[model samples]
Target: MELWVSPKELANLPGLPKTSAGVIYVAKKQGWQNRTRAGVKGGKAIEYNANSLPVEAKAALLLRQGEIETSLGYFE
Candidate 1:
């Protein structure tokens, strides 16, 4: 159940931290696994494994995935 997403996207999800910086600090403190995002224009940004998120955050992601985007521009 791993959904790779950026800190910006994680912050946009329900029940997660409200900001990208907050999400990064939390992920670092919690030691959540991450990997470099490929084909991106930025200088080595990373994406988090959604399975490593908190219970509520995971639940939110699941529901959001079910109810929102299936292709481009998710949750919009």
Candidate 2:
């Protein structure tokens, strides 16, 4: 399954040797921790599932559903 990441978020991700596996690893690490208010700061309160399917699976499903559009010039 293809994974679609926003260009802005992709820019924040680590580069090269740290790409694929590193992205999944870091997201999982962060998810294993308790949900933190510190991260959201003054942003609007949003409800989220702290316990759900794995991140990769969620991303795949989203891609399949056409909920996310791939950025132009990406994976062409």
Candidate 3:
């Protein structure tokens, strides 16, 4: 099972990454799929699976639970 949450919901949400991108990265690492939709007149939203994104959250990301945000900007 999964849940659809908005960026606002993620705002200050405990047991999750700090930034939206960080969350996405962790999701990808955890084998979860992500979806985004842009609405009319400039709009957008995000969603994911609760099971996929368990409270147990890691490297490079500094989420509320001390996540580890990672990016491919060339780093060893």
Candidate 4:
């Protein structure tokens, strides 16, 4: 599924560029699609579809189950 993040939401994420340029950069980096809406923000408001993302990128972003857990260590 493709997820669209608004400029405001994008700004909230740390490390990512806080501008249109950065959005596109990350989109390309993730190898996801960037939608321009035909005119909005000159079509710079990048869009992303995790399914379309590159395997390597997903590896860097996704986490497998049982990989990590937060609990009482020896849960009851």
Candidate 5:
């Protein structure tokens, strides 16, 4: 799932490039595993495993947080 964040959201962060186009690519998770389950207390609990978001998604998130750069084609 690819999403485009408007300049407003990007503006909230300082030092971010003031670009008109801020496209975000979110890759879906693979495998046949339930993502949420009922917790012992009754609330929904999320389970984390190896088969999380596609590698691209993880990379994109990192780029968004400034942990990495979008030198590659993941974010443009």
Candidate 6:
């Protein structure tokens, strides 16, 4: 399933841009749909639609998810 992710959340992940600004740059260039982050006060925070991510980026995220799932099982 697609998820909403902020540049701060996506930056530095495997196969992703190395910085938050770089992720924002690529999202803008790709015209990814974005919305102001909810549950936050002060300034607006942007989050991108994960469905708009490139195939390779999505794959990387999926791999990361698997790692998290596997790690969680370590306590069992």
Best by lDDT: 1
Candidate 1 similarity to native, TM-score: 0.69
- Model 1 misplaced regions, further than 4 Å: 67-76
- 1-76 in candidate 6: lDDT tens per residue? 4567677767857667779878887776776777785565347878777787777777765565544333343455
Q: Taking the candidates one at a time, how many backbone clashes does each contain?
A: 0, 0, 7, 1, 0, 0
Candidate with better lDDT, 4 vs 6: 6
Instruction: Answer with 2 or 5, whichever has the higher lDDT.
Output: 2
The stretch of ten residues in a row with the least summed lDDT in candidate 3 is: 56-65
Most TM-score-accurate candidate: 1
Q: For residues 1-76, what per-residue lDDT tens digits would candidate 3 score against the true structure? A: 2444544445445566567666655556665544567762146545654444445432111243343456555565
Error of 3 at 70 (Å): 39
Model 2: pairs clashing at backbone N, Cα or C within 3 Å: none
Off by over 4 Å in 3: 40-45, 55-76
Query: lDDT of each prediction vs. the true structure?
Result: 0.74, 0.37, 0.49, 0.49, 0.36, 0.70
RMSD (CA, Å), each prediction: 5.4, 13.4, 14.1, 9.9, 13.6, 5.5
Which rank order by lDDT, best down to worst? 1, 6, 3, 4, 2, 5
Better of 1 and 6 by lDDT: 1
Deviating ranges (above 4 Å) for candidate 5: 1-29, 32-42, 47-51, 67-76
Ten residues in sequence with the least summed lDDT for candidate 2: 7-16
TM-score of each: 0.69, 0.22, 0.40, 0.36, 0.25, 0.65
Choose 1 or 4, whichever is better by lDDT: 1
Candidate 1 local accuracy as lDDT?
0.74
Residues 1-76 of candidate 4 have per-residue lDDT tens digits of 4534344344333444556567566665655554556455564544555455455534433432225556564546
**Residue-level lDDT for 31 in candidate 5:** 32
